[PDB]
Protein backbone atom coordinates (compact mmCIF):
# COMPACT_ATOMS: atom_id res chain seq x y z
CA UNK A 1 0.00 0.00 0.00
CA UNK A 2 2.73 2.49 0.76
CA UNK A 3 6.42 2.50 0.52
CA UNK A 4 8.94 5.02 1.98
CA UNK A 5 12.68 5.37 1.65
CA UNK A 6 14.49 7.56 4.16
CA UNK A 7 18.16 8.20 3.21
CA UNK A 8 21.17 8.79 5.71
CA UNK A 9 24.42 10.22 5.20
CA UNK A 10 27.26 8.93 8.23
CA UNK A 11 30.57 10.59 7.78
CA UNK A 12 33.13 7.62 7.96
CA UNK A 13 36.18 8.67 10.05
CA UNK A 14 39.74 7.29 9.79
CA UNK A 15 40.40 4.51 12.88
CA UNK A 16 43.14 1.69 13.68
CA UNK A 17 41.92 -1.89 11.52
CA UNK A 18 41.20 0.29 8.27
CA UNK A 19 43.38 -0.88 5.44
CA UNK A 20 45.00 1.92 2.96
CA UNK A 21 47.68 1.18 0.20
CA UNK A 22 48.96 2.85 -2.56
CA UNK A 23 49.62 3.28 -6.14
CA UNK A 24 53.21 1.18 -6.32
CA UNK A 25 51.79 -2.13 -5.23
CA UNK A 26 52.18 -1.33 -1.28
CA UNK A 27 48.60 -2.81 0.72
CA UNK A 28 48.82 -2.65 4.36
CA UNK A 29 46.47 -1.89 7.57
CA UNK A 30 46.93 0.61 9.95
CA UNK A 31 48.41 0.55 13.26
CA UNK A 32 47.87 3.42 15.60
CA UNK A 33 46.97 7.34 15.45
CA UNK A 34 50.36 8.91 17.43
CA UNK A 35 50.16 12.73 18.25
CA UNK A 36 51.78 14.93 16.44
CA UNK A 37 54.73 15.96 19.46
CA UNK A 38 55.60 12.37 19.44
CA UNK A 39 56.34 12.35 15.29
CA UNK A 40 59.40 12.33 13.52
CA UNK A 41 60.40 15.78 12.48
CA UNK A 42 63.37 17.93 10.31
CA UNK A 43 65.49 20.16 10.85
CA UNK A 44 63.08 22.83 9.92
CA UNK A 45 60.07 21.82 11.53
CA UNK A 46 57.85 19.76 9.66
CA UNK A 47 56.78 16.53 11.26
CA UNK A 48 56.00 12.96 8.98
CA UNK A 49 52.47 11.91 8.87
CA UNK A 50 52.84 8.76 7.60
CA UNK B 1 70.85 31.95 34.09
CA UNK B 2 69.51 34.79 32.04
CA UNK B 3 66.28 35.73 30.81
CA UNK B 4 65.78 34.67 27.03
CA UNK B 5 65.42 37.21 24.25
CA UNK B 6 63.49 37.59 21.14
CA UNK B 7 64.07 38.65 17.76
CA UNK B 8 61.14 39.31 14.78
CA UNK B 9 61.52 38.21 11.60
CA UNK B 10 58.28 37.78 10.62
CA UNK B 11 54.63 39.05 12.70
CA UNK B 12 53.70 35.56 11.79
CA UNK B 13 56.96 33.86 12.73
CA UNK B 14 59.43 34.49 15.86
CA UNK B 15 61.89 32.63 17.72
CA UNK B 16 63.24 33.16 21.28
CA UNK B 17 67.41 32.67 22.16
CA UNK B 18 67.91 31.23 25.57
CA UNK B 19 71.33 31.21 26.80
CA UNK B 20 73.29 30.02 28.82
CA UNK B 21 73.04 26.59 29.61
CA UNK B 22 75.48 23.20 31.57
CA UNK B 23 75.68 20.39 29.74
CA UNK B 24 73.27 18.07 29.30
CA UNK B 25 70.39 20.53 29.77
CA UNK B 26 69.38 22.07 26.26
CA UNK B 27 68.55 19.12 24.17
CA UNK B 28 66.33 17.86 27.19
CA UNK B 29 64.64 21.34 27.29
CA UNK B 30 64.10 21.80 23.85
CA UNK B 31 62.88 18.71 23.69
CA UNK B 32 59.73 19.11 26.72
CA UNK B 33 59.06 22.66 25.56
CA UNK B 34 58.60 21.29 21.92
CA UNK B 35 56.77 18.71 23.59
CA UNK B 36 54.62 21.15 25.67
CA UNK B 37 54.26 23.58 22.72
CA UNK B 38 52.68 20.85 20.65
CA UNK B 39 50.25 18.43 23.31
CA UNK B 40 48.54 21.06 25.01
CA UNK B 41 48.36 24.84 24.63
CA UNK B 42 45.02 26.38 25.01
CA UNK B 43 43.44 28.90 22.55
CA UNK B 44 40.17 29.76 21.05
CA UNK B 45 38.48 27.86 17.79
CA UNK B 46 34.91 27.63 15.94
CA UNK B 47 32.10 26.09 17.78
CA UNK B 48 28.68 25.06 16.32
CA UNK B 49 27.14 27.06 13.73
CA UNK B 50 23.84 28.24 13.79
CA UNK B 51 23.13 29.39 10.30
CA UNK B 52 19.39 31.06 9.01
CA UNK B 53 18.01 30.24 6.16
CA UNK B 54 19.94 26.47 5.95
CA UNK B 55 18.23 23.20 7.05
CA UNK B 56 21.44 20.89 7.79
CA UNK B 57 24.97 20.42 5.79
CA UNK B 58 23.82 19.21 2.19
CA UNK B 59 20.82 21.40 0.66
CA UNK B 60 21.74 24.01 -2.13
CA UNK B 61 21.42 27.32 -0.84
CA UNK B 62 20.44 29.92 -3.00
CA UNK B 63 23.04 32.89 -3.96
CA UNK B 64 25.90 30.68 -2.38
CA UNK B 65 28.57 29.72 -4.77
CA UNK B 66 29.63 25.94 -5.27
CA UNK B 67 29.11 23.95 -1.82
CA UNK B 68 27.23 24.18 1.80
CA UNK B 69 29.68 22.43 3.98
CA UNK B 70 33.47 23.56 2.53
CA UNK B 71 32.14 26.95 3.70
CA UNK B 72 32.01 25.19 7.39
CA UNK B 73 35.41 23.50 6.31
CA UNK B 74 37.04 26.43 5.33
CA UNK B 75 35.50 28.35 8.08
CA UNK B 76 37.58 26.86 10.43
CA UNK B 77 41.18 28.53 9.37
CA UNK B 78 40.25 32.15 11.19
CA UNK B 79 41.96 33.18 14.44
CA UNK B 80 40.21 34.00 17.12
CA UNK B 81 41.62 36.37 20.05
CA UNK B 82 39.28 37.04 23.32
CA UNK B 83 40.03 37.96 26.50
CA UNK B 84 38.61 37.34 29.24
CA UNK B 85 36.24 35.44 27.68
CA UNK B 86 35.27 31.49 27.17
CA UNK B 87 31.87 32.12 24.96
CA UNK B 88 30.91 34.48 22.28
CA UNK B 89 28.35 34.79 19.54
CA UNK B 90 28.94 36.11 16.53
CA UNK B 91 27.29 36.67 13.28
CA UNK B 92 27.90 38.09 9.74
CA UNK B 93 25.61 39.66 7.40
CA UNK B 94 26.27 40.60 3.25
CA UNK B 95 24.17 41.06 0.59
CA UNK B 96 24.76 41.48 -3.38
CA UNK B 97 27.99 39.97 -5.54
CA UNK B 98 31.51 39.75 -4.48
CA UNK B 99 33.20 37.77 -2.15
CA UNK B 100 32.82 36.83 1.67
CA UNK B 101 36.10 37.51 4.30
CA UNK B 102 36.69 37.20 7.54
CA UNK B 103 37.28 40.66 8.67
CA UNK B 104 33.45 41.24 6.95
CA UNK B 105 31.29 40.06 10.14
CA UNK B 106 30.64 42.11 13.29
CA UNK B 107 32.91 41.28 16.14
CA UNK B 108 32.70 42.32 19.61
CA UNK B 109 34.68 45.11 21.66
CA UNK B 110 37.28 41.64 23.08
CA UNK B 111 37.04 39.74 20.25
CA UNK B 112 39.39 40.36 17.47
CA UNK B 113 39.74 38.71 13.79
CA UNK B 114 43.39 38.25 12.76
CA UNK B 115 44.11 37.79 9.26
CA UNK B 116 40.90 38.64 7.93
CA UNK B 117 41.83 38.52 4.21
CA UNK B 118 41.00 34.99 4.20
CA UNK B 119 38.13 33.84 1.64
CA UNK B 120 34.60 31.99 3.11
CA UNK B 121 32.57 31.82 -0.04
CA UNK B 122 31.29 33.86 -2.82
CA UNK B 123 27.88 35.30 -3.31
CA UNK B 124 26.74 35.32 -7.30
CA UNK B 125 22.84 36.75 -6.57
CA UNK B 126 21.40 39.49 -4.31
CA UNK B 127 20.56 37.09 -1.19
CA UNK B 128 21.34 37.89 2.38
CA UNK B 129 23.53 35.72 4.36
CA UNK B 130 23.61 35.49 8.24
CA UNK B 131 25.43 32.39 10.34
CA UNK B 132 25.18 32.79 13.49
CA UNK B 133 28.37 31.05 15.28
CA UNK B 134 29.95 30.52 18.77
CA UNK B 135 33.54 30.43 19.83
CA UNK B 136 34.58 27.79 23.09
CA UNK B 137 37.93 27.67 24.14
CA UNK B 138 39.98 24.14 26.08
CA UNK B 139 42.66 22.22 25.24
CA UNK B 140 43.89 19.19 23.28
CA UNK B 141 41.69 18.54 20.74
CA UNK B 142 38.22 17.33 20.64
CA UNK B 143 36.00 16.08 17.63
CA UNK B 144 32.65 16.23 16.96
CA UNK B 145 31.12 13.16 18.20
CA UNK B 146 33.06 13.23 21.86
CA UNK B 147 31.29 16.71 22.74
CA UNK B 148 27.52 16.23 22.06
CA UNK B 149 17.84 18.81 20.44
CA UNK B 150 17.29 21.96 17.39
CA UNK B 151 17.25 20.71 13.91
CA UNK B 152 18.67 24.60 12.55
CA UNK B 153 22.32 23.79 14.37
CA UNK B 154 24.69 21.97 13.05
CA UNK B 155 27.70 20.40 14.93
CA UNK B 156 31.59 21.49 13.93
CA UNK B 157 35.07 19.79 14.52
CA UNK B 158 36.70 21.74 16.77
CA UNK B 159 40.76 21.46 16.46
CA UNK B 160 42.51 24.45 18.17
CA UNK B 161 45.92 24.93 17.98
CA UNK B 162 47.79 28.41 18.38
CA UNK B 163 51.11 26.92 17.07
CA UNK B 164 51.93 24.44 14.44
CA UNK B 165 55.67 23.82 14.24
CA UNK B 166 58.04 24.36 16.73
CA UNK B 167 61.40 23.82 15.66
CA UNK B 168 64.84 23.89 17.98
CA UNK B 169 68.69 23.27 17.33
CA UNK B 170 71.56 23.79 19.82
CA UNK B 171 75.03 25.94 18.97
CA UNK B 172 78.24 26.63 20.61
CA UNK B 173 78.21 29.67 23.12
CA UNK B 174 81.27 31.67 24.03
CA UNK B 175 81.91 32.40 27.53
CA UNK B 176 85.49 33.45 28.76
CA UNK B 177 85.67 31.44 32.03
CA UNK B 178 84.28 28.39 30.65
CA UNK B 179 85.14 26.07 27.95
CA UNK B 180 81.51 24.72 25.98
CA UNK B 181 78.20 26.51 26.78
CA UNK B 182 74.73 24.94 24.89
CA UNK B 183 73.06 27.99 23.46
CA UNK B 184 69.56 27.05 21.54
CA UNK B 185 67.27 28.92 19.68
CA UNK B 186 63.55 27.92 19.63
CA UNK B 187 61.82 28.77 15.76
CA UNK B 188 58.23 28.83 16.71
CA UNK B 189 55.68 29.45 13.60
CA UNK B 190 51.89 30.85 15.57
CA UNK B 191 48.66 31.09 13.35
CA UNK B 192 48.42 34.80 14.77
CA UNK B 193 46.47 33.80 17.93
CA UNK B 194 49.40 34.27 20.57
CA UNK B 195 52.97 36.08 20.82
CA UNK B 196 55.72 33.50 20.46
CA UNK B 197 57.23 34.68 23.77
CA UNK B 198 53.97 34.33 26.03
CA UNK B 199 53.67 30.78 24.39
CA UNK B 200 56.47 29.92 26.19
CA UNK B 201 55.86 31.33 29.11
CA UNK B 202 52.53 29.76 29.14
CA UNK B 203 54.61 26.08 28.17
CA UNK B 204 56.86 26.74 31.18
CA UNK B 205 54.67 27.22 33.66
CA UNK B 206 52.03 24.48 32.48
CA UNK B 207 55.83 22.47 32.73
CA UNK B 208 56.09 23.67 36.34
CA UNK B 209 52.52 23.19 37.29
CA UNK B 210 53.41 19.39 35.78
CA UNK B 211 56.96 19.13 37.83
CA UNK B 212 55.12 19.60 41.08
CA UNK B 213 53.91 15.85 41.74
CA UNK B 214 57.32 15.25 43.35
CA UNK B 215 58.09 18.41 45.63
Request: with cysteine.
Amino acid sequence: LKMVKVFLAVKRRIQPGDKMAGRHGNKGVVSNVVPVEDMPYMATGESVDI
Amino acid sequence: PRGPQIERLTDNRAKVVIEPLERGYGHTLGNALRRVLLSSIPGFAITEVEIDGVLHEYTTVEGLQEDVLDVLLNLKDVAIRMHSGDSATLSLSKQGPGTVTAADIRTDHNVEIINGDHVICHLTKDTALNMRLKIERGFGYQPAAARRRTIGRLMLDASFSPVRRVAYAVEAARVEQRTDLDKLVIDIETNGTIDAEEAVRTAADILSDQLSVFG
